[PDB]
Write a protein that binds this ligand. Structure first.
Ligand SMILES: Nc1ncnc2c1ncn2[C@@H]1O[C@H](COP(=O)(O)OP(=O)(O)OP(O)(O)=S)[C@@H](O)[C@H]1O
Ligand SMILES: Nc1ncnc2c1ncn2[C@@H]1O[C@H](COP(=O)(O)OP(=O)(O)OP(O)(O)=S)[C@@H](O)[C@H]1O
Lengths: 741, 394
């Protein structure tokens, strides 16, 4: 039968769809995906889900449209879905109930064949192809299946909706109940079964009448593409009876639903309407939070859909994976200069100041969510201030990162207030509820933020940080409402030392202005100091003039290939397929590293001027080393992977013991003595080692490992080079090292 | 959806006709008889709403009488038509009611915006005036706020009374039905011929360097720098990476005898789009931007921050010393050009301002401190000078 309004005939669709629901297997999906193969040898996926639901009575069947797509002879339906949801959904539910019936007439007992057939069945097709957010939504697709992302602002309280009337038992004494099946409600003039009152005033008992949940959910899409000038848009939503309350305020949900368009009234007295319809989205399915908190539930059966959703994590969350892409990934991971390479691969236009890039990269992979049943909220990510002499790429690095990440929210300082930093709540008097608004920090829930002129920020502001940075929550308490909105977000602030540059006659923690609490709050502080080198200076000048040479300049730095686009998907794979477990050996070297950090910081006059190593130093070391191990796709933290973490934390501090003001205008006498004693000992060994030849490595294990920590061993290279000039020994091939006759 | 593009002046050159159609005129120039004429106007777009689907042919299915009835979209105020005129159920005492169906009908994009004057077309008197525009058809989403653009179409008031009272009158609203758009600043004409004249006239560099400020003689060098500023015109959007502001930020230093405020009047009169102000003339939020979260559509309204007005123009500034350094943050923000981000009062968004800043400052000790070194006279913390490109102490 052809449809007068869609010309999409039913019989063929239902017929193909039936054996579609019986021919379905995991493999179709795998072939399109191209991922490595079993799924218990590809059992029938749909009968799996169908049996499970029949036994659980969910009557809701989640479905990824790409699955139905990846099967032969169904793409017709796969597109008609995107084009005729209003009826393909109907025929889908019909087929669902009918295959339930065939299954139960094959499967002896379930619902006695009737309780099943009585209750309806709804389908939940999600992930039909992510549309291009709001500003793309065309009035040409008024009735199509859109996918939208973005957090929700406000949820109207549960609103009932008439479904079946229950009309007043008249003096005739036989109440009558009737549904509506449209926006119309008909009350029969005559009274009840007997026409005791043919003329009658039938009334309605609006308490026993059934109802249906209709929740209106405003939505503010993610600022993935919002160019400038306009605040990210908003698309009101409606939800019908099963996904209701699956989305509280503040959540970061994703939705797949049909677009709609309805006129409005102006006077509301006369029946005349207005052109320029208003629009919303009748949702169909809601990807729950796109998060992994899993503290407690929110709603009814819907959580069963959430459990059916979370298990397929790999392809659905990567949104793209191929072992040619994954092979490229593992290959890159194999490359040795990785930590260097990817560093520059973040901001290729940025010059030699690599350690900044390193810290930034480590921020991108930030930490792992260790969720405790007791305690909890251990700020899974990190936070990086950076400061230094004006005009030193800081602000541009921030721009660069904010562009890199898929969730960044740029923001300035001193042009912003505490409300801007942490959403502000409003008791809406319309429905007397809690709405949240414009959290700059909340927009960045997940993924980094950026903040400039951090010093120039007001003291009235720069106080919400004192909370959000260490608990990732904001506890607002004003006249109407008290609440705590959690905003997990890795801040990344620029700065400017007081005045307009250093004063290497001034203490460092005074040269930075911020108070020590908020300062130690920052996981990692950089001091990008400007030098008068004249050795890098001309290199930098060339590094600018070259980009000015071309018209459309690319790869401003050395011409080494680096994957400007690949690295983003690389990151969004790493942060989600690997969770570093801190092995035992790491624990030791981490503890000793902390102890050494703190004992060094010890002093009597370190109290007022220095930055003291405190427990957050250990938090930094651990949350940062596990991020390093997440990089390189390492599944478990090694021991030689916290060492560079220590190095990075020491980027700021290396050069002062009792008083700050590093100074350190970079061959020392104590270095002379070091080389000299090493020469003594190594000559004594090689003259005691009668087999006069041994490798540099063997010699190192002979001496440099007998006791406490190994030495550079390139200072050993200079030692043996001296012993070549002096000719006390002879390398005699790289494999060994002999002495002189 | 078909549209018309106004002819270039080429045809009026060879065949002079009613050329007023293609002549760009300001909204002030709209005469009472010009209502209905295909008119090209230029200015600045503002408050462009988002795409809204407006119906064109309203359908009505009865579901009982079958006949799909189609009515025409009147002025924005319309009515859902009453009981059907279908003959399937008719000719009896029965008639099945009809109702619309979005799929059965037809829609099309619709947008509004407003236009303001170039600020060099308004007298030294009255306030600039706005003008509605209803963008229709596939021309939607091809626009943006803040672009110099020649828009063309018809000029109509539609009949509708606000209070819907008895007396109607005619509250003459307007709209330029978007028949075509020309977004300038991405000529081979008489202007380019005179340009060739200029390039041939020689010394053009030092020529302009002299003709600039052609009321005052002396201090040629600073006028040279002003020439370099007003020309500007470089940039490096490096692509897949860091943008680089190709604009100029030149600052002065001196005493009233330098007449530098006169130089500023000169330049930002000479520069198109140019704007003048003082250090204390506009507060911080006044100069950068003021946003209102419009409650009607709950949207963002930008109320003319001096800087955003200054986009694609040179901002003249006086008394920059007394600019209340707590306000120096905005300007300091400007060194990082064409990005003014604001995250306050429930709004957290950016607004770009392609601007070059010209400042005028004073030594803190009045005329000058000979006993003290430079940069003492110049109280500006080096994190501001470094953003400047040229400093001219006089
Ligand atoms: N090593 C470098 N690599 C790349 N660009 C550089 C480098 N040093 C300076 N620049 C450029 O110099 C300018 C300095 O910009 P930024 O340093 O980001 O601004 P800023 O340093 O934040 O200014 P302040 O005073 O610190 S707020 C930019 O155009 C940079 O591209
Ligand atoms: N080279 C010159 N040619 C013509 N007039 C000049 C020249 N130099 C100075 N003047 C005069 O100097 C007067 C002083 O102008 P002012 O605007 O008061 O100075 P100024 O621009 O305010 O300097 P500031 O801002 O106080 S440091 C002007 O009215 C000019 O007529």
């Amino acid at each position: 039968r052809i449809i007068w309004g869609t010309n999409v005939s039913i019989q063929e669709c239902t017929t193909n769809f039936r054996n579609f629901l019986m021919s379905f297997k995991y493999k179709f999906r795998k072939i399109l995906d191209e991922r490595e193969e079993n799924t218990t040898d590809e059992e029938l996926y749909y009968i799996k889900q169908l049996n499970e639901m029949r036994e659980l009575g969910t009557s809701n069947l989640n479905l990824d449209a790409r699955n139905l797509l990846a099967y032969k002879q169904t793409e017709d339906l796969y597109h008609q879905l995107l084009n005729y949801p209003q009826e393909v959904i109907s025929i889908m539910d019909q087929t669902i109930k009918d295959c339930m019936v065939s299954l139960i007439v094959d499967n002896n007992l379930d619902y006695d064949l009737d309780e099943i057939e009585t209750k309806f069945y709804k389908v939940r097709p999600y992930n039909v192809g992510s549309c291009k957010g709001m500003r793309e939504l065309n009035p040409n697709d008024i009735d199509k299946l859109i996918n939208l992302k973005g957090l929700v602002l406000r949820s109207t309280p549960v609103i009932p909706d008439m479904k079946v009337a229950f009309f007043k038992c008249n003096v005739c004494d036989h109440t009558m109940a009737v549904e509506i099946d449209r926006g119309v409600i008909q009350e029969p003039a005559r009274c009840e079964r007997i026409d005791c009152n043919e003329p009658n005033s039938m009334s309605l008992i609006h308490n026993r009448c059934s109802f249906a949940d209709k929740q209106v959910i405003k939505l503010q899409e993610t600022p993935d593409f919002v160019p400038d000038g306009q605040t990210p848009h908003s698309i009101s939503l409606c939800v019908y009876d099963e996904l209701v309350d699956s989305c509280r305020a503040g959540d970061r949900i994703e939705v797949t639903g049909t677009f709609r368009s309805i006129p409005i009234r102006a006077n509301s007295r006369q029946r005349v309407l207005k052109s320029l319809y208003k629009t919303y989205v009748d949702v169909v399915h809601v990807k729950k939070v796109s998060d992994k908190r899993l503290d407690v539930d929110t709603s009814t059966i819907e959580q069963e859909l959430m459990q059916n959703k979370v298990d397929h994590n790999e392809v659905e969350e990567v949104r793209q994976i191929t072992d040619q892409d994954l092979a490229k990934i593992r290959e890159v991971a194999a490359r040795e200069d990785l930590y260097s390479l990817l560093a520059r691969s973040i901001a290729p236009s940025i010059y030699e100041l690599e350690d900044v890039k390193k810290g930034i990269l480590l921020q991108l992979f930030g930490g792992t969510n260790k969720t405790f049943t007791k305690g909890g909220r251990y700020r899974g990510d990190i936070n990086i201030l950076l400061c230094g002499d004006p005009s030193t790429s800081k602000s541009q690095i921030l721009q660069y990162v904010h562009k890199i990440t898929p969730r960044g929210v740029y923001t300035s300082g001193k042009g912003s207030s505490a409300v801007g930093l942490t959403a502000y709540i409003t008791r809406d008097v319309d429905t007397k509820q809690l709405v949240l608004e414009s959290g700059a920090l909340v927009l960045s829930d997940g993924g980094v933020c950026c903040i400039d002129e951090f010093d120039k920020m007001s003291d009235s502001t720069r106080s919400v940080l004192h909370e959000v940075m260490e608990q990732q929550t904001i506890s607002i308490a004003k006249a109407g409402i008290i609440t705590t909105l959690n905003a997990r977000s890795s801040i990344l602030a620029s700065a400017n030392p007081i005045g307009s540059r250093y004063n290497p006659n001034l203490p460092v923690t005074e040269n930075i202005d911020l108070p020590p609490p908020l300062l130690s709050r920052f996981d990692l502080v950089y001091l990008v100091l400007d030098k008068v080198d004249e050795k890098n200076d001309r290199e930098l000048a060339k590094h600018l003039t070259n980009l000015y040479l071309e018209d459309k300049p690319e790869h401003i730095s050395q011409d080494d290939v680096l994957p400007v686009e690949f690295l983003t998907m690389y990151i969004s794979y790493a942060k989600e397929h690997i969770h570093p477990i801190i092995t035992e050996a790491a624990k030791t070297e981490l503890v000793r590293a902390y102890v050494g950090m703190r004992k060094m910081g010890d002093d009597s006059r370190s109290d007022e001027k220095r930055i003291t190593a405190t427990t957050r130093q250990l938090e930094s070391m651990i949350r940062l080393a596990e991020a390093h191990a997440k990089m390189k796709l390492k599944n478990v933290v090694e021991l030689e992977d916290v060492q560079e973490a220590v190095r990075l934390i020491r980027s700021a501090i290396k050069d002062y013991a009792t008083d700050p003001k590093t100074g350190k205008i970079d061959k020392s006498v104590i270095q002379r003595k070091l080389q000299e004693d090493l020469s003594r000992e190594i000559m004594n060994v090689l003259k005691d080692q009668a087999s006069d030849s041994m490798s540099f490595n063997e010699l190192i294990k002979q001496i440099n490992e007998h006791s406490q920590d190994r030495v550079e061993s390139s200072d050993i290279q200079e030692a043996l080079s001296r012993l070549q000039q002096e000719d006390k020994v002879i390398v005699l091939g790289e494999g060994v090292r002999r002495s002189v006759r | 959806f078909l549209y018309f593009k106004p002819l270039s002046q080429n045809c009026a050159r060879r065949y002079r006709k009613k050329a007023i159609s293609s002549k760009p005129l300001s909204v002030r120039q709209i005469k009472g008889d010009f209502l209905g004429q295909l008119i090209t106007v230029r200015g600045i777009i503002t408050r462009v709403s988002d795409v809204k689907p407006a119906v064109e042919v309203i359908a009505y299915t009865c579901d009982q009488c079958g006949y799909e009835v189609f009515q025409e979209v009147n002025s924005r105020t319309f009515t859902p038509l009453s009981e059907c005129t279908s003959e399937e159920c008719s000719q009896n005492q029965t008639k099945g009611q009809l109702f619309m169906s979005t799929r059965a009908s037809k829609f099309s994009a619709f947008q509004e915006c407003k236009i303001q004057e170039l600020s060099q077309q308004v007298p030294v008197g009255h306030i600039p005036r706005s003008l509605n525009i209803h963008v229709n058809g596939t021309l939607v989403r091809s626009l943006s706020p803040g672009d110099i653009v020649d828009v063309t179409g018809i000029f109509l008031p539609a009949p509708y009374t606000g209070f819907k009272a008895l007396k109607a009158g005619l509250l003459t609203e307007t709209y330029l039905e978007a028949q075509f758009v020309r977004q300038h600043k991405k000529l081979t004409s008489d202007v380019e011929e005179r340009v060739m004249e200029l390039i041939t006239s020689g010394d053009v560099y030092n020529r302009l360097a002299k003709s600039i400020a052609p009321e005052i003689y002396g201090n040629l060098d600073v006028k040279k720098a002003l020439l370099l500023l007003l020309v500007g015109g470089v940039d490096k959007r490096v692509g897949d990476g860091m943008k680089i502001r190709g604009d100029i930020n030149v600052c002065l230093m001196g005493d009233p005898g330098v007449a530098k405020s006169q130089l500023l009047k000169a330049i930002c009169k000479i520069s198109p789009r140019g704007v003048y102000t003082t250090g204390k003339g506009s507060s911080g939020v006044g100069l950068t931007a003021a946003v209102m979260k419009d409650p009607v559509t709950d949207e963002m309204i930008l109320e003319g921050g001096a800087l955003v007005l200054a986009d694609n123009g040179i901002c003249c500034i006086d008394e920059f010393d007394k600019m209340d350094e707590s306000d120096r943050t905005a300007i300091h923000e400007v060194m990082e050009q064409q990005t003014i981000s604001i995250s306050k009062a429930g709004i957290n968004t950016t607004l770009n301002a392609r601007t070059s800043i010209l400042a005028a400052a004073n030594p803190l000790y009045g005329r000058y401190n000979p006993r003290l070194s430079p940069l003492d006279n110049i109280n500006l913390p080096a994190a501001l000078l470094s953003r400047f490109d040229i400093l001219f102490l006089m």
